[PDB]
Symmetry: C3
């Protein structure tokens, strides 16, 4: 399961990073679908490959290590995670949790995250942005919650509440920014349900999930959100609707992931702009 | 993970405990929520710490380790489990199963369990008692059932049915005792769904669970109930509603009454 | 302890089997409920116990891989399955299906025992799977969790026509012309990891999820088959009628479940034989 995400190990990693950069991040960004360009446009960037950080978890896109990117975005100090640890890859709870807990010790106060999701809600269109206002953590309700195991008291409490998990003030700001900039029609809010994956959802599964009250379904994000809330980081999360879920078996349409990647690539410019304009107006500073 | 909960290992733990006490328990009790007294009220008590028993699972520090308390309660021999093993802590199936199977070998015929739960059913109020009449074992449906692995045939069958899992006669008696003693207005019956935890449930999760047909939600109890039924122990289980679930994102006290209820139920239990 | 179901290891197993038999199978059959007597019908056959195939998983007498001819077609039959409720790993379940693929299997046919949730179902009915709900898979116990084995398939497999519509059609037509079309339905199968039978509250929930039958197997093998491009036909025998009411004295009994399966075994075998008979030949 790699190194335990305890205070000792997390501090060690944080200190290693702090020798490599003088940027003290206020906002952490986990790049998902549509955020590829935002990562590139970080100003005065310093790129730290995961390979160069002892005990930091290792992931690659066909050979190329992920990176931590420090710098600024709209005048605000950020750290960007370029490369994530999805549970369908077989990563441990400790692997997924360590980077978020490292962000806490580095100074991160807000986490912004995107992902690719299937649209269950029948009003959604391809390319829509669905701000998460709540979630259903199917793995968590089973016995695959990321927090299962000894609680690391240094970071949070044994039984965390998830009441305002998707900060209502950050959601209101994100909607306002979209509306002010002429793409409010693309922005929805909804409930995201996690399918552990990596299979796309069958029509019967989608029909069930829609009837549970779910608006979008995806295979990521909730584990990161749980760790973030556990250690008191405010969360803003957006699903890009990269496929419209098929609810009937009598239908030749299907999710193919390349069209999922195409939707991400085509909405990247707008999602970058949105996130930059949100960051510009975030409170505290 | 510690030691396999097979008939040989369970036999050895049971034999060791039988040297430390002459009490042959007829009723096993696991108090979760309202565990104030009961263990206080047992006459002629014998407190056996978990560390005193070899191969018996041990709690993780906390400044207060587990005990197995033997004695009598309202004229019946009992064994109380103080110190539980919950799956959200990372305990293995064998760790949770072994204690219940030890109870079986010691002579336990009835298991009484209390726990703390979130109220999903909209007519519940904080402090209410909800007798479990059925459950939904979400971890079990999802391939984290406590019985996964080789079946221990000496305890039970490969594919146990869970018909009358929460004995209907015990529930009827429990309801009779509550109404007889003036706190019948607190008592409900319902379906308990297990959230593996340890996070509390989001509004959207609570809404989904309510619409699945669940009345309360908690992070324990079902694994123990499944092991109990597998080896033929009758089960009585009750949730104390300690949090009322919020359904949309837009939006100690009963300790003495619960221990008293359990004491009065045991008084009225049939005896062979 | 189990060997990874990667192309290197699967090749080694398939190459060992290919020295023990000349039969190149194009249909793979996994014997579940109602298919106990299927191995008997296989002609020009060779029985290979799992015990004499290195790194092939071991299940219990040992399980066998039977090669031969059924209704004129080359088949491999798995007598002995690896149920997840027994504690078997994903690799253990996946390897046999991937071996089938390297051996040449194009169609996988499978039966299982299931509880009938749909209130119109009768005991002994056949429910062809047209779709499924993989509760373990949704909850992070999907058989494909781990590094994707690219030799076999893609990272994010779609499950759109998982239960091949042409095979389902043919199966329904074969039943109808042989006079048992009234026993045949099509439905959604939900997986309960098991090994407990379902409580009344669980059954009620599953029925309201849109499920017709519930069982403890099959989906993991189906996912692996679809991942490597094998077409799938699957049928649940309704071996118990699910009890939705806690006050009812009715309950699932495993001896009655096995008895129901055995009673239908001749008919289920004949059905499978006649499906294979009518499959398009190239």
């Amino acid at each position: 399961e790699s190194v335990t995400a305890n205070i000792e190990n997390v501090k060690k990693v944080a200190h290693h990073i702090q020798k490599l950069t003088s940027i003290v991040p206020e906002i952490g960004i986990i790049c998902g679908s549509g955020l590829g360009k935002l990562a590139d446009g970080v100003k005065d960037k310093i790129t730290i490959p995961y390979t160069k950080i002892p005990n930091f978890p290792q992931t690659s896109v066909v050979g190329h290590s992920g990176n931590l990117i420090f710098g600024t975005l709209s005048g605000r100090k950020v750290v960007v995670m370029q490369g994530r640890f999805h549970m369908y890859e077989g990563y441990s709870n400790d692997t997924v949790a360590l980077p978020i807990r490292v962000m806490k010790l580095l100074g991160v106060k807000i986490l912004m995250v995107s992902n690719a999701a299937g649209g269950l809600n029948r009003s959604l269109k391809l390319g829509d942005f669905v701000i998460l206002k709540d979630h259903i953590y199917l793995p968590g309700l089973g016995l695959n919650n990321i927090l299962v195991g000894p609680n690391q008291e240094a970071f949070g409490t044994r039984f965390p509440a998830l009441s305002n998990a998707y900060d209502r003030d950050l959601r209101k700001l994100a909607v306002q920014v979209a509306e002010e900039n002429g793409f409010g029609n693309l922005v929805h809010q909804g409930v995201y349900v996690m399918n552990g994956g990596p299979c796309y959802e069958t029509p019967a599964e989608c029909t069930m999930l829609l009837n549970m009250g779910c608006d979008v379904v995806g295979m990521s994000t909730i584990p990161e959100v749980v760790i973030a809330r556990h250690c008191g980081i405010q969360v803003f999360a957006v699903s890009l609707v990269t496929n419209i879920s098929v609810l009937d078996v009598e239908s030749d349409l299907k999710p193919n992931h390349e069209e999922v990647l195409a939707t991400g690539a085509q909405r990247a410019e707008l999602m970058q702009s949105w996130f930059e304009k949100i960051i510009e107006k975030l409170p505290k500073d």
